[PDB]
């Protein structure tokens, strides 16, 4: 997409980045004048204004300024001040477009003669760059293509000075041959270094002091921004005159540049009442022509497109932007919103339409009170869900929404909107049944679709032989051949895939725009690959020309970048062409037909598939060459391929605006090279009715000359003998008429409709439709990983953090599914803190240290330590809790409990310490006990345990309440004393081992700390001394 | 058992599951110490055929961030004195989101870079101590200790629901046994 | 019902090649268990079938058995035996 930059930006870039031996003059010497700024500030930072004379001219991409009298030459500072006022901020009309003047440029007046008025131009073409040099430049330049000297510099070819001196410096003065030539070379080096597509200098004046540039018109390849974002800086692309750009256009441009998907939005008339949601550049263009053919060109508001499978969020953002744009002003008749598009090949209709319905739900109020009516037509993957969700969103919001499916001819909704109709060497053959292809990148959905297409085409082997993904090792990816399971190899390197699969002759490059060039260049080094399909959109034009040059040298056929690919029914399918298997069967693309078509668009290729299937026998082969400016293969390649192909009987060509490519069809037909019937239509007539230079979604959808208009191409094809319909509406009818005329003469003999092989439905598809039942083998109630937000037992994580929960609160949510009070969470945290570690002498810490000193792992060492947590070590928490709970529920007094447990012979769990007996408690039992007294509402089990402790202390001083016993009794009291739990819930949680989890979680901290300490101290392998083992082995066994 | 179930769950904590924390921390620390700019780091990762650890979500891309990367990021901005590696990772995140919208700083990568910043931008540690703690697997322990709560919660949930013995369906397994060995 | 009739198509999430529990007889990597016990292969033969999916010769299976024999135990002082003893004395 070549975008025109302002004169100020162009001269700034030229001054900063040119490298010439000539003394460039007036470097960084200009001034910007805008209505919304002060004046003195422009003075003290520009002292040159008073030093020399001045000249003023509007820099808003306006040409013919001198002929229209918009320039004031040879005026002083006061002169230019007096000159601006009658024009600054005023209304002007250039050509057909009218607009205001918010930008002016001030530069020194250069005293120059007519003899030094030089014309320079460098503009890119498919084969290279044309440089036009005219000695008598300026206003009297006259004809340029017939008088100015022209020089071609090929792709990846340098412009040496002597070629310029000979071919381009014939009529120039001799004394300035050298420096000027150097300047040209430097300017030429400036051209491809910053990926300029058009650079026009007139006038250019050279004097003994140096060189001077007066005006320059520059169009630069915006898609190369990721290569020049350092050198361009914050480059701005001004809108054409009379466009009055808006910040939402900038937002949509940033969204488009932020992702591989294409999101184009251009506000033609904010006061209009017709707005469009049409997916794809070709669909957008044809919808624009359909609207303009009904007289809605004046009421058309915006031109927009979303392609490249936009996601949920991107589509939602674009829809909310357009909805906020259409809410500003209220129209008495109402507003019309058209959600159109072709039959999508791989754009998920469900996700895009879900984003759209979310935006509608967010802006339903203003939409309802604006009387906005929505008409929707869409087809492609999961279009049923999109149509239905539109149905319920329209029903619930009350917005009048009328949705339609594939049965609509893609233009009935426009007629229903405006009240016109009621609302109800390169090879000749590239692919065959034995074609094997290699897919670059993880595109399992596209490969699976290709395999399904091969199966329904009764192919012997799958068309995908290998897959290439540089970010993973070699393995096998599991796919389906019909119903049977197959494995397709996936390689890290292209060389291995080419070595192990010598039968592969096609590459389908799914690499992004940043990797498509390198991948294609590497693939072209292998002679076995005869066809390469590039899917990526946004590749810089110069890189694409480099690919075309290498392919032409090597003879490889490039399916132009930014395409869905192509389809040959019965033989081969590229990528996601033709939609899912349902669209393949509906369009009967599993067997060959007799019509072969070429189109720029990808979704419109599927529309052509549908039209040809409905009106004729079928499709023999269909190719979408892409919407880029320079496709890898033009119309000539594929049309000549079809003409040389005996299988076809008729050809359909569906071009777009810009590019003298259909005139090549006309010239080929002129001497009879093309003999088979041809039906050609060129979309883009709506560009003739617009008072602007709007750039369509396709990069190559830009008409530079006046002969590249759609009307001119259609007319020329009309006298060329091509069956050209009146509009896109009559394309189906004219194609059907041509097919009937051709079959009436016996040229076409339709074959018998053999049913295709049956492919089982996908399980996920059946679940989505609610067709089958499969019981769930699991059940969880603690955490919800799916959804927009992480959920902890009903509480979102953001709500978890806003409520100022801690480890205790999250633990309660995850373990008990309860909203515990603050004191309960703090008590849980304290219990985890006191059980964190108790030294390395215990069994678990010992095992952790042993595993760590073996240099095994953090997880392994923690695991070995934790596996000793059981009855003897770490189970005293749960054992004491159960013991005291049973004693308390039995109702026996503590003395009776102590006597019973003495007589029966089991130790009282949670009672008894070694050294700390009295006047020196455990002192971490004291902390938890004090907290429990302070904060716990009721502690009956704690009081019972304390009475038991008082009884047992009279026996021996060391029989006190342990940390384990205190934690157990206080945890039971917390469970059965707070309102979160009933008695049954607390009993179940105690029985299942909640306190075991408490102890394990607490001691995990200490075990991991022990592992980290052992790693930090760098301890070697431990072997137990033999003197501490005491072998007692038997005498002989 | 509780211990056995927690243990079997924790044994999967390794490179592929739960290892993005330490891997992302080491990757970003090496990138920051090497002195290369974030663009050079991204290009070096792409050339080596390595995915940037801690970058990339499945659904949450823009206008809908992770809702838990945001909380930690806001806390780190508000409380942490200086976060150089966090800024470096955020520049890398900007570049990756310029590539693809859902290539955002994951919770693993965010926690890794913020933990490195907390280690080496507080007065407690010298640079070599922070490097050693990163090397020996401090974030591995952090992830294991955090996910232990969820694993014990899962065990308790399964016990409370009284789920029976699991047997994987035969239709979900592909038997590719040899013809006769 | 839809899987038996082949109306739906669900990819399998697991792949195995060592043992086939289903059917009228247990299979160890292509060889039935009865056949496994017919040619008198022992621990070595079963180990080879399960680990390598190969019919190892008799000397290879006997050598595998000998390797298992010599690595059976090497005292309690080693780290693994020490950890086993520690976990056992905890009565776990
Ligand atoms: C090209 C592709 C297939 C895939 O490209 P993606 O960018 O998505 O994925 P990636 O290749 O992974 O690239 C992302 C980068 O992030 C890197 N990365 C990943 N993980 C990372 C991590 N963890 N850390 C660091 N980095 C990581 C990865 O390494 C890569 O790095 P890099 O190579 O440098 O870029 C996609 O763009 C695409 O389809 N374009 C469409 C273009 C096109 O043909 N249009 C016309 C077709 S007709 C149409 O559509 C209209 C219509 O609508 C019709 C209708 O409806 O009417 C219809 O549908 O028919
Ligand atoms: C995680 C933790 O905090 S550890 C929790 C452990 N839980 C327990 O209390 C288990 C049972 N009790 C114990 O084993 C104590 O912890 C210990 C280790 C102090 C008891 O070990 P001992 O060395 O036997 O202590 P001591 O020698 O003072 O015990 C002597 C007498 O007290 C009795 N006794 C010891 N512990 C208990 C108890 N918990 N309940 C009742 N009586 C006990 C013994 O029966 C013994 O009987 P005797 O009078 O016939 O000799
Ligand atoms: C599976 C295996 O067979 S082990 C294979 C190990 N891998 C290798 O072979 C790689 C290189 N090997 C080595 O590191 C060395 O050659 C070794 C370890 C095999 C040789 O052992 P050394 O390095 O001499 O240390 P060693 O194991 O002898 O220990 C020193 C002494 O402690 C004694 N000792 C060994 N184990 C114990 C124990 N559990 N308690 C008390 N004393 C012990 C030994 O008798 C030995 O006595 P010595 O020094 O008089 O011979
Ligand atoms: C080492 C051993 O032999 S296990 C020893 C167990 N001993 C005991 O516990 C004795 C008590 N007895 C019992 O509990 C029962 O009699 C059992 C479990 C032994 C017998 O099994 P059953 O109760 O009939 O249930 P079974 O295990 O057959 O499974 C039910 C069905 O699911 C099917 N099935 C089994 N595994 C799977 C799987 N992975 N995927 C899908 N389906 C499966 C079985 O084919 C069975 O159907 P069938 O009866 O038509 O063959
Ligand atoms: N610095 C300058 N010194 C002298 N004349 C200038 C200067 N800048 C512009 N001009 C005048 O502007 C005219 C160029 O107009 P032109 O480039 O044909 O308009 P447009 O760019 O709209 O086609 C020249 O005739 C020249 O005399
Ligand atoms: O590890 C602990 O918590 C202390 C312990 O069990 C003991 O009494 O030996
Ligand atoms: O020799 C073995 O079998 C291994 C072993 O126990 C040792 O020496 O560490």
Summarize this structure briefly.
Chain A: The modification N6-acetyllysine is found at residues 478, 484, 492, 886, 906, 916, 1015. This is part of a larger assembly, with 3 copies of chain A. By secondary structure, chain A is of the alpha/beta class.
Largest interface, C-beta within 8 A? A-B, 63 and 53 residues
> Radius of gyration of chain A over alpha carbons?
39 Å
Strand content of chain A: 15-25%
* Helical content class of chain A: 25-40%
Q: Name every ligand kind in the structure.
A: (3S)-citryl-Coenzyme A, acetyl coenzyme *A, adenosine-5'-diphosphate, oxaloacetate ion
Major β-sheet profile of chain A:
7 strands, antiparallel
Describe this structure in words.
Chain A: Residues 3-264 form the ATP-grasp domain. This is part of a larger assembly, with three copies of chain A. Helix content of chain A is 39%, strand content 17%. The first copy, chain A, has a domain at 247-418: Rossmann fold. The relative contact order of chain A is 0.05. Chain A has 1037 residues and is of the alpha/beta class. In chain A, strands 1, 8, 9, 10, 11, 12 and 13 form a seven-stranded antiparallel β-sheet that branches. The interface between A and B is large, with 63 and 53 residues. Strand 33 (761-762) of chain A pairs parallel with strand 1 (8-9) of chain C. Residues 1023-1026 of chain A line the site of one acetyl coenzyme *A (ACO).
